[PDB]
Amino acid sequence: PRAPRTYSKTYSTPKRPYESSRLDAELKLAGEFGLKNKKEIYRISFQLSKIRRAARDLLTRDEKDPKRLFEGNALIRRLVRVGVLSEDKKKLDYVLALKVEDFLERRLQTQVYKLGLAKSVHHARVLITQRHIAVGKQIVNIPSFMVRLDSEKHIDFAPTSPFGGARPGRVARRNAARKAEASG
Amino acid sequence: SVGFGLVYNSVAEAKKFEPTYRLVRYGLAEKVEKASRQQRKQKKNRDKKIFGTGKRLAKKVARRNAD
Amino acid sequence: GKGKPRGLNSARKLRVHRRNNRWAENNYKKRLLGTAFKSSPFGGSSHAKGIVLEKLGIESKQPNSAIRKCVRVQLIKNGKKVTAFVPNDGCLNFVDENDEVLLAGFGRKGKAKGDIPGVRFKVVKVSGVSLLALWKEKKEKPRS
Amino acid sequence: HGSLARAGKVKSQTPKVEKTEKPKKPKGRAYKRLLYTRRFVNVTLVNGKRRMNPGPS
RNA sequence: GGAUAGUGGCCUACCAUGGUUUCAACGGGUAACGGGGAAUAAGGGUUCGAUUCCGGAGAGGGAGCCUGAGAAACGGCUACCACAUCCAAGGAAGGCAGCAGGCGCGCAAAUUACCCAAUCCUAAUUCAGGGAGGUAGUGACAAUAAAUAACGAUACAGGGCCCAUUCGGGUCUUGUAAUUGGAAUGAGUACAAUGUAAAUACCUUAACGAGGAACAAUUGGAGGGCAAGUCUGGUGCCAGCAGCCGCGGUAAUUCCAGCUCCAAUAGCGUAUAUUAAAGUUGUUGCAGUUAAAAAGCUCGUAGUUGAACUUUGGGCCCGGUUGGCCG
C-alpha cells in the first residue's frame, strides 16, 4: 500500500579484517582526529570509493563527451564546495587520487581544534556533542558537518549558551549558595 | 519556528470553511461528545439486525415475557 | 583446439554441456535435488526443537583420549533420532533427560566437527535459557 | 566407556576466585586515547619487536 | 450449423489423415505465481524475488447460478465432501489466504488500542460511510546520526632553541611516576509552549538531573593463519577446548579462575542458505601422458564448423570539426 522508504548503508567494511598496516593507519587517523569508533573512517572510505568509482567511470570516456562535461563539472564543483579540493587545482586526476586525510582534514571537529576554543580535540568534540556551538543561527551537535565557510567566521557563543554572558548559570548560583553555606 | 498561519475574511467565513476539529481547537465551536467507534458500529449492526422501528418487536417481547 | 566448441551457433551445445557438467558440483547437485528437504533431518531448516532421550559417552578419535557426552534427541517435526553435542561443561548434568532443547547445525554444513563421530548438531537453548548464560549463572534453569 | 559422569570435574575443583578490586577503567573514546598514548607516542618498549602485552619476567 | 458480445474444434454432424518432435515433442519434478527488482563491485557472471508497484489467481475442495453494465463473487446464494452451538431429539446458521486476538505448526515474528484529523473511493452526490487508509503499544530482521561523560594543574624525564659558570633553569606541557577543584551538558521532569483526537515523540523553561562502590559496556580470543602472555593458581590420557591444523603420560603461552590486554565496539558471537573467493563450472577462462579424466578402433545421421575468387583505385569541388597564416 504505502510507498517504501529508501535507505542505504554508509560504510563498507574492509575485506581483509586484520592487518597491522591498515589497522594502525585507521587507528592513528581516528585518534589524531579525535574520533571514537571506526564507523567514521569506514563511512568516509565508502564515500571516497564511491567518488573514485564515479571519476573512473567518467574519465573512461573521451573529452567533450556531453555526459562527461555535465557529471565531471558537477562532481568537481561539489568537491571544491565541500573544501576537499584546494582552490586552484581542478584537474580531476587528483579527484581520482583523493585522500581520506584530505576529506577528514576539513572536518568540523578538527576545525574547532585548530581554532583552539577547546585547547584539545577531546574537549572540542565534547563541546560539539554538548551543543555549545551555534554554527550559524542554529546549534549543531555533530562533529561531521562539512561546513560552508561562513560558520568559520560566525563561530561564537549562542544567546542561549554558557561561557558568554547574559546568564549566571544554575550550577554557578548553586555553588555560590554552597560557598555561602560553607562559610556560615 | 515556521508554520502554516493563515487568515480568513471574517469569522462567519472561517466557521463555514473550517472543520470541527479546527473549530474546537480554536474555541469557535463546542466539543460535541461522541461515542467510541466500536460502540457506534455495534448499534449500526444492531439496528440492521432488527428490521424497522421495532415497536411490534417490543410488543412481542412483552407478550412472551407475560408467559 | 581447446576442446569445447567455439562456433557462433554453438550456444545450445555450450549450454547443455554446462548443465551436464554443472551436475558434478556438490552443492549445486544437493540444492537442485533437494536432499535438504527429502533426506536432511532438519528438512532444510536453520534450527529444530528436540526432546532429549538419553546420554551417550562416545569417545574421541585419535590422537585423543576423552568422551564427548552427547545426547540422543527425538525431533518434533521430522520424528528422527539424532545424536547432538551439548558443548559446555556440566551441560549433560543440565539436560540429563526429557528437557526441551533447541538444536542447530555444527559449522560444517553437515559434517562431524572434530574428533567426535556421528554428531552434526549442537544445542543453543534449553527450554528458553541459553547454555552459556546458564554456564555463567546469569540465569537459572526453569524447573517449572 | 561407561563414562557418563564426572562432567565438569575442573569446573568443580578449581577455586572460585573473584577479580581484584580496581576502579572501572576508561571506556570508548578515553580508552582509544589511552591506546594511542601507549602505542604511538610511547617509546618505552621498542626493543626488538615493540611488544604489546609483555608478560612479567 | 449451433452457442457466445463477438472469430475459433468453443461444441455438433459429414469428410480426408493429419499436428508436434533429437532445434528435445510428450512425460516427470518444481522446498515454481510472473515482471519491474535484490544482493558481486574488474569485465563476464551466480542466486533469489511470497512481499509495499503492475499483471494473474483464490476466499475450505471442486461444480452451478440469479442480480448486476461489469462476479462463475463467497463479509451472494444453490447442493456434495471434511470442519463446524444447542437441543425445548421439531430444526436453525457459516466459512478471519480482510484487522486485532486463540490453539496447533512452530525456525520463523505485533496488543482482542484510537479515528476519519492527513490519500482516495462509494452515493440520489459538499456534509454520510470506509480495521481501505492514518495514528499508538511490542519489536535489536533492517538502515542514519550518535550517550556510558571531557576537563586543567608537574604531583619533571629538553621541541621549536637557548643560558653555554658539565641534569643549576628552561618561561609551554610533554618527552607521567597511584594528589586533581567548573564556568557547562544529555536521557528523564512534558505543571506548560511545537505538536495530533484529550497525554507521549524533536526545541525552551522560573525549578531537579554527575566529583563517578552515582547514570559503572558487551561479545570472541592471546600457537598459527589472524596482533592479542612462557603472566599466575587448578586438573594432568581426564575434565574440556578446538569453524582447520593441534593443546594435556603431575611445568598446558590452546582446558577452568583473574589481570593485562587485541578486534568490533550498543555492538558483537553463533547455526543454516546464498554471493565473491572459484581460472575448484572455465563464453571471456580450467584440466585429460604419470595427479580425476582421450571412448578399444573405425563408420555415420542430427549438431557444430568448413579453401580462394565478383568495384579495385585513381580525379576534381565544398558546408564544417582538434595544438594548428594570427595572442
From Swiss-Prot, chain A:
One MF term in the entry's GO annotations: structural constituent of ribosome
InterPro entries, per database record: Ribosomal_uS4 (IPR022801), Ribosomal_uS4_CS (IPR018079), Ribosomal_uS4_euk/arc (IPR005710), Ribosomal_uS4_N (IPR001912), S4_RNA-bd (IPR002942), S4_RNA-bd_sf (IPR036986)
Record localization: Cytoplasm; Nucleus, Nucleolus
Keywords: Cytoplasm, Isopeptide bond, Nucleus, Phosphoprotein, Ribonucleoprotein, Ribosomal protein, Ribosome biogenesis, RNA-binding, rRNA processing, rRNA-binding, Ubl conjugation
Cross-link (Glycyl lysine isopeptide (Lys-Gly) (interchain with G-Cter in ubiquitin)): 179
Region described as Disordered: 159-184
Pfam families referenced in this protein's UniProt entry, alphabetically: Ribosomal_S4, S4
Domain S4 RNA-binding positions: 106-180
Single GO BP term: maturation of SSU-rRNA from tricistronic rRNA transcript (SSU-rRNA, 5.8S rRNA, LSU-rRNA)
SMART domains recorded: Ribosomal_S4, S4
SUPFAM superfamilies noted in UniProt: Alpha-L RNA-binding motif (SSF55174)
KW Ribonucleoprotein (keyword) present: yes
In-chain residues carrying the UniProt-annotated modification Phosphoserine: 183
Gene Ontology cellular component terms for the protein in this record: 90S preribosome; cytoplasm; cytosol; cytosolic small ribosomal subunit; nucleolus; nucleoplasm; small-subunit processome
PANTHER family: 30S 40S RIBOSOMAL PROTEIN, 40S RIBOSOMAL PROTEIN S9
Note: Present with 106000 molecules/cell in log phase SD medium.
Family: Belongs to the universal ribosomal protein uS4 family.
Stated name of the protein: Small ribosomal subunit protein uS4A
UniProtKB/Swiss-Prot annotation, chain B:
Record note on modification: N-terminally acetylated by acetyltransferase NatA. Also partially acetylated by NatC.
Region of interest called Disordered, as start-end residue ranges on this chain: 34-67
Subcellular location(s) of the protein: Cytoplasm
Stretches with biased composition (Basic residues): 37-47, 56-67
UniProt function note: Component of the ribosome, a large ribonucleoprotein complex responsible for the synthesis of proteins in the cell. The small ribosomal subunit (SSU) binds messenger RNAs (mRNAs) and translates the encoded message by selecting cognate aminoacyl-transfer RNA (tRNA) molecules. The large subunit (LSU) contains the ribosomal catalytic site termed the peptidyl transferase center (PTC), which catalyzes the formation of peptide bonds, thereby polymerizing the amino acids delivered by tRNAs into a polypeptide chain.
Subunit structure: Component of the small ribosomal subunit (SSU). Mature yeast ribosomes consist of a small (40S) and a large (60S) subunit. The 40S small subunit contains 1 molecule of ribosomal RNA (18S rRNA) and 33 different proteins (encoded by 57 genes). The large 60S subunit contains 3 rRNA molecules (25S, 5.8S and 5S rRNA) and 46 different proteins (encoded by 81 genes).
Family of the protein in this entry: Belongs to the eukaryotic ribosomal protein eS24 family.
Other observations noted: There are 2 genes for eS24 in yeast.
Name assigned to this protein: Small ribosomal subunit protein eS24A
Entire-sequence positions represented here: 69 to 135 of 135
Curated annotation (Swiss-Prot), chain C:
Positions where 3,4-dihydroxyproline occurs in the chain: 63
Effect of residue 63 to A: Lethal mutation
Molecular-function GO terms, alphabetical: structural constituent of ribosome
Biological process annotations from GO: maintenance of translational fidelity; maturation of SSU-rRNA from tricistronic rRNA transcript (SSU-rRNA, 5.8S rRNA, LSU-rRNA); regulation of translational fidelity; translation
One GO CC term on file: cytosol
SUPFAM superfamilies: Nucleic acid-binding proteins
Coiled-coil segments: none
Post-translational events: Hydroxylation at Pro-63 affects translation termination efficiency. The stereochemistry of the 3,4-dihydroxyproline has not yet been determined.
Subcellular location: Cytoplasm
Claim: Cytoplasm is one of the keywords in the record: yes
Keywords: Cytoplasm, Hydroxylation, Isopeptide bond, Ribonucleoprotein, Ribosomal protein, Ubl conjugation
Numbered residues of crosslink Glycyl lysine isopeptide (Lys-Gly) (interchain with G-Cter in ubiquitin): 55
InterPro entries linked: NA-bd_OB-fold, Ribosomal_uS12, Ribosomal_uS12_euk/arc
UniProt cross-references to Pfam families, sorted A to Z: Ribosom_S12_S23
Miscellaneous comment in the UniProt entry for this protein: Present with 10600 molecules/cell in log phase SD medium. There are 2 genes for uS12 in yeast.
Function: Component of the ribosome, a large ribonucleoprotein complex responsible for the synthesis of proteins in the cell. The small ribosomal subunit (SSU) binds messenger RNAs (mRNAs) and translates the encoded message by selecting cognate aminoacyl-transfer RNA (tRNA) molecules. The large subunit (LSU) contains the ribosomal catalytic site termed the peptidyl transferase center (PTC), which catalyzes the formation of peptide bonds, thereby polymerizing the amino acids delivered by tRNAs into a polypeptide chain.
Record-given protein name: Small ribosomal subunit protein uS12A
This protein's encoding gene: RPS23A
UniProtKB/Swiss-Prot annotation, chain D:
Keywords from the named record: Cytoplasm, Phosphoprotein, Ribonucleoprotein, Ribosomal protein
Region described as Disordered: 1-31
GO-annotated cellular components: cytoplasmic stress granule; cytosol; cytosolic small ribosomal subunit
Span of the signal peptide: none
Record GO terms (molecular function): structural constituent of ribosome
UniProt subcellular location: Cytoplasm
GO BP terms: cytoplasmic translation
Modified residues (Phosphothreonine): 44
Keyword hit for Nucleotidyltransferase: no
Residue list for modification Phosphoserine: 12
Major site of localization recorded for this protein: cytoplasm
PANTHER family: 40S RIBOSOMAL PROTEIN S30/UBIQUITIN-LIKE PROTEIN FUBI, RIBOSOMAL PROTEIN S30, ISOFORM A
Subunit structure, interactors included: Component of the small ribosomal subunit (SSU). Mature yeast ribosomes consist of a small (40S) and a large (60S) subunit. The 40S small subunit contains 1 molecule of ribosomal RNA (18S rRNA) and 33 different proteins (encoded by 57 genes). The large 60S subunit contains 3 rRNA molecules (25S, 5.8S and 5S rRNA) and 46 different proteins (encoded by 81 genes).
Role summary: Component of the ribosome, a large ribonucleoprotein complex responsible for the synthesis of proteins in the cell. The small ribosomal subunit (SSU) binds messenger RNAs (mRNAs) and translates the encoded message by selecting cognate aminoacyl-transfer RNA (tRNA) molecules. The large subunit (LSU) contains the ribosomal catalytic site termed the peptidyl transferase center (PTC), which catalyzes the formation of peptide bonds, thereby polymerizing the amino acids delivered by tRNAs into a polypeptide chain.
Family indicated by similarity: Belongs to the eukaryotic ribosomal protein eS30 family.
